[PDB]
Amino acid sequence: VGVNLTGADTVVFYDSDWNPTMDAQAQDRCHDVHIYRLISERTVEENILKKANQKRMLGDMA
């Protein structure tokens, strides 16, 4: 929608989207700040979040 109101912390990522540069925009808008990704254990969540981090690193290095 725009530059969300500043002064907000504890960004709760309810679900990871596996989409290109989603949390990067939130981090840029926010930037003390804190991050809380709701990682549901006992599932592929770990491997798919590793994939998402690799995608974000590639998009940042591009």
Partner: protein, 97 residues
């Protein structure tokens, strides 16, 4: 970069990602043009209706020397605002939708 584009008489397209302060960059360009080039024109700025107030506040915040004219309201109010707006130095930056 914008100042170089202006000096060499070319038009610009700023494609910086959202949130990087393109508004602030354009305001600083206007500040340079006003201070070093002596050009404070009538500088038209066409923005979405949702960000007219945001642009006005950013201008009032960063560059307080620009005469800002927000072109909004009913037809009668627009006519009242246009009355005498052709005179020189009546306004420096106009903000419309």
């Amino acid at each position: 970069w914008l100042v170089t584009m202006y000096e060499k008489k070319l038009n610009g397209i700023l494609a910086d990602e959202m949130g990087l302060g393109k508004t602030i960059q354009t305001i600083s360009l206007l500040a340079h043009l006003a201070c070093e080039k002596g050009n404070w024109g009538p500088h038209l700025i066409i923005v979405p209706t949702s960000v007219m107030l945001n642009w006005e506040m950013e201008l009032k915040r960063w560059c307080p020397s620009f005469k800002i004219l927000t072109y909004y309201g009913a037809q009668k109010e627009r006519k009242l605002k246009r009355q005498g707006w052709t005179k020189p130095n009546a306004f420096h930056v106009c903000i419309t939708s």
